Design a protein around this ligand. Structure first.
Ligand code: 9HJ
Ligand code: 9HJ
Ligand code: SAM
Ligand code: SAM
Ligand code: ZN
Ligand code: ZN
Ligand code: ZN
Ligand code: ZN
Ligand code: ZN
Ligand code: ZN
Ligand code: ZN
Ligand code: ZN
Lengths: 269, 272
């Protein structure tokens, strides 16, 4: 039987609660990390927060016209009137998104502020059959909807190079990383799928320091209620981890299962 | 003859929890636009604020932070907020302590009892044209003593930078090296609050997402019950008036006014 073990893993820091349930095993709600809703720093990074360094728009409407400078910074604003990615949006090679900011002339409710407005969908941390904890939707989610941000500890690549536990690392684009092992949000629990239903997009909001894009997950297709969320962790992850464990996503397109790995090595010979 | 007109529906452009409208029933001055409204402090040079999460003092509370064991409350002797978010009656309004609110490192939840200022504006205010002092800010409702009103928000600048700025009419001094909040070019609603010699709000230094003591955030709390329609005002202090008295005098109208033309003249006469 599935029981609601924690009413909100985010401790009230998100717009909506994120409960945790486990109907698979005896594992209690995870507590070996610190939930944070926004990225943190553990060393001197000096993110460029100078307000005069922000590119910004002069719109006095809702930023829905093609004349919005912030939209032009990403070719065009990719958000429709409902805050969802346009359907033409390149989900294979996503552009950088520049949302409106505190230097823009527009109001806080304009159409170019989806990610900075936070989580709106109902998500749940749940125990999966084969992959530990995972995150699933508690509602239908149309294609192009903002889900959540990959939040954690900002670290340099040199620091990432010496960290033991690399299971919760997201590479940003000298390069930096978000390590969600010790400090992270709900995204640290999202598993890898070889047939993913969310995609990461690099976004700029209150600063435009190009070393530190913020990573926003949007649905790449319609997601049904109860479906597990997953993104493609990529080849760096799997080149490292395949020798320790194999993919359990179960897709017919799986490239990282024990079977898939074995079939590739057999054709080598 | 002259009617009160609503000139701006919200000077904050939706950035606060509530709209802050602007009205004028005094003169023909339109909504002020010679500044940029920001709801949080901005930086225009490298300030190197200590934002390292491991440097935060934080509590281990598993309740709502109402117990005497909350470290964050202990950092100010005690938590000074009652269950409704208002300062205790014993709060020292003459020399207020530093307040350390709970933060992202504390074990407690976002709704604990020690998070008043970080939750933003809750009272209903209005920017309005005063009779003698330009724009001012007044209450649209009764406000009990001890209630958080708004933060003094603007551009963080060094003492050396403040020393070279022409317009010093919107400066709040923070105090090693010293910093200032300049609300002339970037500011929130607080930039429009006038000076009162009998003030009804007091500034309190508060720490929230960081604890870099060079950069307290300035929170105004009511020092007494405030009536509907009453203009808000704080004591700008002697540095302001030592500079400005030669250009204009106080129009607050209090019998206790210490900066009016009359008060200045009576001091000149007592020398002679
Ligand atoms: C420029 C790349 C930033 N760097 C250094 C890095 N390092 C990883 N891992 C190791 C960390 C420990 N050292 C002993 C060797 C390298 C790593 C592992 C990832 O997933 C298993 C991953 O997934 C997206 C990204 C990763 N990124
Ligand atoms: C930490 C910053 C300390 N500093 C430098 C400062 N300077 C002010 N003014 C002047 C600026 C132009 N220089 C040529 C001379 C000094 C000044 C004026 C204030 O109100 C009229 C005030 O009110 C609270 C605070 C002020 N603070
Ligand atoms: C960022 S975490 C995801 C949350 C994790 N399941 C947990 O319980 O904390 C990454 C780890 O989840 C597991 N995992 C994620 N995707 C997987 C997959 N497709 N197949 C097998 N294990 C997976 C692996 O242990 C991986 O190192
Ligand atoms: C920070 S501003 C306050 C908002 C200002 N009234 C406005 O219209 O922008 C400070 C200036 O307001 C005016 N002021 C504020 N308090 C005053 C007072 N008690 N008596 C006369 N003028 C005052 C002076 O011009 C002063 O330099
Ligand atoms: Zn715009
Ligand atoms: Zn906009
Ligand atoms: Zn904009
Ligand atoms: Zn797979
Ligand atoms: Zn506490
Ligand atoms: Zn607390
Ligand atoms: Zn605390
Ligand atoms: Zn006065």
């Amino acid at each position: 039987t599935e029981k609601i073990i924690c009413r909100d893993v985010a401790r009230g820091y998100e717009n909506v609660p994120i409960p945790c349930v486990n109907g698979v095993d005896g594992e209690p709600c995870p507590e070996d990390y610190k939930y944070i809703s926004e990225n943190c720093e553990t060393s001197t990074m000096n993110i460029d927060r100078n307000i005069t360094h922000l590119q910004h728009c002069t719109c006095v409407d809702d930023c829905s016209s093609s004349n919005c400078l912030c939209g032009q910074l990403s070719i065009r604003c990719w958000y429709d009137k409902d805050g969802r990615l346009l359907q033409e949006f390149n989900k294979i090679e996503p552009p950088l998104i520049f949302e409106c900011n505190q230097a823009c002339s527009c109001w806080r409710n304009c159409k170019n502020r989806v990610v900075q407005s936070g989580i709106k969908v109902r998500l749940q941390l749940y125990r999966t059959a084969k992959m530990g904890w995972g995150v699933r939707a508690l509602q239908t989610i149309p294609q192009g909807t903002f889900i959540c941000e990959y939040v954690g500890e900002l670290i340099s690549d040199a620091e990432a190079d010496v960290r033991e536990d690399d299971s919760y690392l997201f590479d940003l684009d000298e390069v930096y990383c978000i390590d969600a092992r010790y400090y992270g949000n709900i995204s640290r629990f999202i598993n890898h799928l070889c047939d993913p239903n969310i995609i990461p997009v690099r976004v700029f909001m209150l600063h435009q320091d190009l070393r530190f894009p913020r990573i926003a997950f949007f649905s790449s297709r319609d997601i049904r209620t109860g479906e597990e969320l997953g993104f493609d962790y990529g080849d760096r992850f799997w080149d490292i981890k395949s020798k320790y464990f194999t993919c359990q996503c179960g897709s017919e397109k799986c490239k990282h299962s024990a079977e898939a790995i074995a079939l590739e090595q057999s054709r080598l010979a």
